[PDB]
C-alpha cells in the first residue's frame, strides 16, 4: 500500500501559536501511576523501596517533591552518650529534651537515659582526673519529614566520622552521617554509588543488624553499640544499575517495593497539558506553539505516534536551548530551530558521507534499474544514530542450494544477521521445490561495508535481491528497502524506522530528487513513523514515496514493476530462472 501524506502526518495542529500558556503544575508522578502507587504502599507500610527507570526521567526530582508533601511525628532527639570511656551508644529522647539532660549533666527525670546515668557514677573516690552528650540531630516538626539525599555513598558520609584531638578521642568527636540524619524519615541513595564506593555490604549490616560504625583511622577506637534503625530507605537507579544488586538475595529481602517508571507515557491532551504546567513551574515562558512542538518532539523521541517520551529532564534540556534561540521565549520556532541545531552540531559524519557519495568514492544509485541490487538501510551506532542507505548485491549461479552471506563469512555480520540469512534460506528452499533442492548458489554482499553489521532488518532487501538475481528481474534503485522476514516470507517490523527513511531521503536530496524516490517498509511499522517536516512535505509534493508491505513478494512487485501472477508475472520468470540454473547444473 502507498502511504499518502495524509496517512503520514502525525503532528499536532497549532492554533494561536504565540499565545502564552497558563496552566497549573501537574502533581508529581503524573503519567507514572505504577511508580506512585508502589511508593504509596512503601510509605504506608514503612517498607524500603527502589525507584527504577532509565536516566533523565526526573526520578530524583519526582521523589523529593513527593516526600515534601508528607507528614510524620516530629523526630526524636538523636545522640551519642558514653556508657564507658571506650564505649558509646545511640539513643532517642522525645524531642527538645536532650538540652535539659545536657544542662543537668552540665551541672554534674529522663527514664530513657538510664544506662548512661548509671555508668555516669569515682573521681572523688580516687582523685581520678569526654562525658557530656553529643547531640547529632533535632528538628521542630515532622512536616516535612526528614529527607536526606546522599548521592555520594562513601562510608564516612553514610556513617559519620571519628575526629581525633591530639591522639585522643571521645563521644564529642563523633560526627553523624546521612544514616543518622535520616532517622524518623527518608534516606535516598543511588544504587550505582553504593556499588562504586563498595559500601553495599556495610549498608546491609546497618539495615539488617543496626551496625552503624563511625569511620576510624588505622591509635585506639571507641566501640560503638548497635542501635535499632528508624528510617525508610529509597534507592534510585536504572534497570541495569539494579542488576548488580538483584543477584544478592539480600537485596530483594531488604527492598521489597519496586517503583518502576515507564520510559514513555500515552500521547494524550492530559499529558500534553501536564507537560505545559510542568514547563511553567520550571520557569519557562511558554507559548502554545512551543508547548505543541515539544510535545511532538517527545512523541518523535519515543518513535511512536501514540506515545510520548517520559524523560522530563531531556525535554527540559531541549527547552533550555530553545529558550536561548527565542531570546527567553519558548516558541514553535525556537523549538524547531533548537532541534535542527542539535542535528547540525552532530552532522559532520553525514556531511563527510554525503560528500563521498557525491564524489563517487562511495558508489550508490538512486535512479534507474538494476538486477540483483537494492538500497538497504542501516543505522550508524553512535549517537545521534543517523540512518544511511547501503548498497546490497545478490549474485546467482548454478550450484548446490547455497546462500552465502559474504559479510557473515568474513566475520562482519552478527548473530541476528546470520539468523536473518538462514531464515531466508529456509524460505527459499521450501518455497521452490520442483527441482528438488535449489539449483543455485546465491552470494549477498553489502558492497562497500567495512564495519560490523548486526540485526534482522536487511532480511527483506536480501530476499528480494536474491529473487531478482534468480529471475533476472531489474529492480528500481530509486526505492530503498528495510524489513525483516520470517520463514514464511512475511515482513516483520524493524527499529529506527525514522532514521532509516530520513537517511535515504537525505542521499536522494543530495544527489537531486528525481520525483520518484522512496522507501519500502513494514506495514507493521506504521505506528512508528514520526517523520520530520522535510520528508513529510516532499511526500506531500509528490517528490517522495513510502510503501508499506506485509510480504516479501509485495515488495518485489513494487521493485520489479509487476505482479507475481497474471502470468506474464514475476513468479513464472523466477521459475524460469531456476529451470535454467537446474539445466546448467545437471546437463
Amino acid at each position: 500500500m502507498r502511504l499518502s501524506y495524509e496517512a503520514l502526518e502525525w503532528r499536532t495542529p497549532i492554533e494561536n501559536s504565540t499565545e502564552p500558556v497558563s496552566l497549573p503544575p501537574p502533581p508529581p508522578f503524573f503519567g507514572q501511576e505504577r511508580a506512585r502507587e508502589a511508593l504509596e504502599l512503601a510509605i504506608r507500610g514503612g517498607f524500603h523501596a527502589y525507584l527504577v527507570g532509565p536516566p533523565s526521567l526526573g526520578k530524583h526530582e519526582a521523589l523529593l517533591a513527593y516526600l515534601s508533601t508528607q507528614s510524620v511525628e516530629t523526630p526524636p532527639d538523636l545522640l551519642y552518650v558514653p556508657l564507658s570511656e571506650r564505649k558509646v551508644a545511640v539513643l532517642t529522647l522525645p524531642s527538645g529534651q536532650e538540652i535539659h539532660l545536657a544542662e543537668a549533666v552540665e551541672g554534674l527525670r529522663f527514664p530513657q537515659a538510664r544506662a548512661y546515668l548509671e555508668a555516669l557514677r569515682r573521681y572523688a573516690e580516687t582523685g581520678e582526673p569526654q562525658w557530656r552528650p553529643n547531640l547529632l540531630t533535632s528538628s521542630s516538626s515532622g512536616t516535612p519529614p526528614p529527607i536526606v539525599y546522599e548521592p555520594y555513598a562513601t562510608a564516612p558520609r553514610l556513617f559519620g566520622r571519628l575526629d581525633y584531638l591530639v591522639w585522643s578521642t571521645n563521644v564529642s568527636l563523633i560526627r553523624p552521617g546521612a544514616v543518622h540524619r535520616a532517622q524518623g524519615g527518608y534516606l535516598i541513595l543511588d544504587a550505582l554509588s553504593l556499588k562504586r564506593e563498595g559500601t553495599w555490604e556495610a549498608f546491609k549490616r546497618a539495615l539488617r543488624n543496626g551496625q552503624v560504625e563511625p569511620v576510624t583511622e588505622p591509635p585506639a577506637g571507641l566501640e560503638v553499640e548497635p542501635f535499632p534503625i528508624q528510617m525508610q530507605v529509597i534507592l534510585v537507579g536504572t534497570p541495569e544499575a539494579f542488576e548488580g544488586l538483584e543477584e544478592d538475595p539480600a537485596f530483594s529481602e531488604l527492598f521489597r517495593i519496586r517503583a518502576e517508571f515507564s520510559p514513555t507515557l500515552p500521547a494524550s491532551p492530559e499529558n500534553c497539558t501536564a507537560l505545559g504546567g510542568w514547563l511553567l513551574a520550571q520557569g519557562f515562558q511558554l507559548t502554545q506553539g512551543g508547548l505543541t512542538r515539544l510535545y511532538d518532539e517527545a512523541r518523535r523521541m519515543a518513535e511512536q505516534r501514540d506515545r510520548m517520551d517520559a524523560r522530563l529532564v531531556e525535554i527540559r534540556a531541549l527547552a533550555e536551548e530553545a529558550a536561548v534561540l527565542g531570546g527567553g521565549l519558548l516558541t514553535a520556532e525556537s523549538v524547531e530551530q533548537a532541534i535542527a541545531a542539535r542535528e547540525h552540531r552532530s552532522f559532520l559524519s553525514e556531511e563527510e558521507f554525503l560528500r563521498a557519495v557525491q564524489e563517487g568514492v562511495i558508489r550508490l544509485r538512486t535512479t534507474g534499474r538494476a538486477v540483483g541490487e537494492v538500497n538497504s538501510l542501516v543505522v550508524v551506532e553512535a549517537a545521534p544514530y543517523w540512518g544511511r542507505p547501503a548498497r546490497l548485491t545478490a549474485r546467482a549461479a548454478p550450484g548446490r542450494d547455497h546462500l552465502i552471506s559474504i559479510d557473515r563469512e568474513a566475520g562482519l555480520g552478527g548473530q541476528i544477521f546470520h539468523k536473518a540469512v538462514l531464515t531466508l534460506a529456509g524460505y527459499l528452499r521450501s518455497r521452490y521445490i520442483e527441482h528438488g533442492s535449489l539449483p543455485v548458489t546465491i552470494s549477498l554482499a553489502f558492497e562497500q561495508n567495512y564495519v560490523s553489521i548486526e540485526g534482522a532488518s536487511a532480511g527483506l532487501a536480501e530476499l528480494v535481491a536474491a529473487l531478482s538475481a534468480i529471475g533476472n528481474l531489474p529492480l528500481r534503485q530509486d526505492l530503498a528497502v528495510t524489513g525483516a522476514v520470517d520463514q514464511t516470507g512475511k515482513v516483520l517490523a524493524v527499529g529506527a524506522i525514522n532514521a532509516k527513511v530520513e537517511g535515504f531521503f537525505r542521499v536522494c536530496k543530495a544527489l537531486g530528487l528525481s520525483g520518484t524516490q522512496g522507501v519500502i517498509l513494514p506495514e507493521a511499522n506504521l505506528a512508528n513513523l514520526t517523520l520530520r517536516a522535510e520528508v513529510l512535505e516532499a511526500v506531500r509534493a509528490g517528490q517522495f514515496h513510502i510503501y508499506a508491505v506485509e510480504t516479501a513478494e509485495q515488495a518485489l512487485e513494487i521493485l520489479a514493476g509487476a505482479r507475481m501472477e497474471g502470468f506474464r508475472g514475476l513468479q513464472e520468470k523466477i521459475r524460469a530462472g531456476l529451470e535454467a540454473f537446474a539445466r546448467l547444473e545437471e546437463g
Binding site: 538497504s376 538501510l377 542501516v378 543505522v379 550508524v380 551506532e381 553512535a382 547501503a390 544477521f417 561495508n449 564495519v451 560490523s452 553489521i453 548486526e454 540485526g455 534482522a456 532488518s457 536487511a458 528495510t482 524493524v494 527499529g495 529506527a496
Partner: peptide, 5 residues
C-alpha cells in the same frame, strides 16, 4: 562505528 540493520 558498527551498524545496525
Amino acid at each position: 562505528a558498527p551498524e545496525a540493520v
